[PDB]
Write a protein that binds this DNA or RNA. Structure first.
Ligand SMILES: [Mg+2]
Lengths: 251, 250
DNA sequence: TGCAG
């Protein structure tokens, strides 16, 4: 339906150079299939984002850096009006992580769109938790008339959100709100996804979407979510070692 | 014993306190473990001078001729040498490089490699550029060789994930052996008092990467232990690092 | 040549 917002969030694994060009074409095929209004990307590198800017011309692009690897937000120009953007630094990151924000108008409503790729690996629980607190604070404090959508690769694992006292009042995790469905829970699954070779099997819900409605208007609900990218491409590999999330909202 | 054995150890040659007593310590380990290959980091000329005098069962290759540098020792009775080379790391600020010795071990070609990757927490950028060079050389090594890289990589787990992980066919031996808790940390300021610091840091800097030969059945690691975790007569440890002893099913 | 849980 028309006023329904659609998004894709995906860590595209730009740090994996193997078949990277073919995999960027694969990403583009999913974007053409799903025509999302907003795309939140992690682990872009300059060659990858240059390619997307050549192909996905119906989108406006914002990046979290100009070199190394970084996040991106793409906004569908026919659907989403860009207002302003900013980058918030993570003071103690060892991995150049940060918080990229874009404020936009959509369906007569202000949206505050955010993405990050939180500090990586089990052993970085402490720094990752520090960054999570910064993200949740920015969600809470965002302009009262805006719907806030954070979507990114949080690297979060069991009990790390519980250990900060859970999500604050007014903020939900979309996968939780849609019923905690096993069918679309794990976004990183090394048994199912053969892109990285690993000594031990694991399944984690690293990619997450957090939603806050406007404080001054009726709340909106998520509609549906699905994991995407579970097809192999012509080159015999998946688009990424992560599955993407496609999600719609009742805006 | 058909099993190949190695020791890898950063000897901390930049710490000159009790250096002769500590080299004697290392030699005691070599006499006990009689490894087929020793991969050493942070040798200095005084140190390697001592080792060459004592460890007469070994053929020595050194990664430089002054300052501090790496070395590979080959047990002459077990390993036949073929050729060696040094790959330069163009943007190192610490004279780091990749030292490679190709050898045969009862007829099976081994491609032996060591490096001391750029030091310090804040050098992740140059360290990971060097790691990429290492992993590329392991991937491209001759199909008929078993590859063993062992060195002081100064790596943090995320730095490896952040280059895309280890390439297919390449494993980290400690991971492959089950991520065992008591042979995990190789630089541990709580357990090792040679460095006087007021904080606790426990790091897995010393690592071994293994690739099989296509021309032979796959190689698995057999057993690993951390060594050097006892004080010498002088009241210091052999190094601020623990050494790694490891065997392979070859 | 500054952890992990
Ligand atoms: Mg040192």
């Amino acid at each position: 339906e028309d006023s329904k917002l659609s998004i894709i969030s995906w860590n595209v694994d730009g740090l994996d150079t193997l078949n990277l060009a073919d995999r960027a074409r694969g990403l583009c095929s999913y974007l053409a299939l799903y025509t999302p209004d907003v795309v939140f990307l992690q682990e872009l590198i300059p060659a990858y984002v240059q390619y997307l800017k050549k192909r996905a011309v119906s989108y406006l692009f914002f990046e979290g850096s100009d070199d190394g690897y970084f996040t991106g937000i793409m906004l569908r120009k026919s659907r989403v009006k860009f207002l302003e953007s900013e980058i918030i630094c993570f003071p103690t990151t060892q991995m150049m992580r940060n918080l990229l924000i874009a404020q936009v108008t959509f369906s007569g409503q202000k949206l505050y769109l955010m993405t990050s790729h939180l500090e990586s690996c089990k052993n970085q629980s402490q720094e990752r938790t520090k960054q999570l607190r910064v993200v949740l604070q920015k969600i809470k404090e965002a302009p009262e008339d805006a719907i806030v959508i954070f979507a990114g690769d949080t690297n979060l694992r069991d009990a790390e959100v519980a250990n900060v006292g859970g999500l604050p009042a007014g903020v939900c995790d979309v996968w939780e709100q849609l019923g905690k469905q096993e069918h679309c829970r794990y976004t990183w699954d090394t048994k199912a996804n053969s892109n990285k070779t690993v000594p031990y099997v694991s399944r984690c819900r690293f990619d997450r979407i957090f939603l806050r409605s406007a404080k001054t208007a009726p709340p909106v609900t998520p509609d549906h979510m699905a994991l995407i990218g579970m097809e192999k491409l012509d080159c015999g590999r998946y688009t990424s070692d992560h599955w993407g999330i496609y999600c719609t909202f009742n805006t």
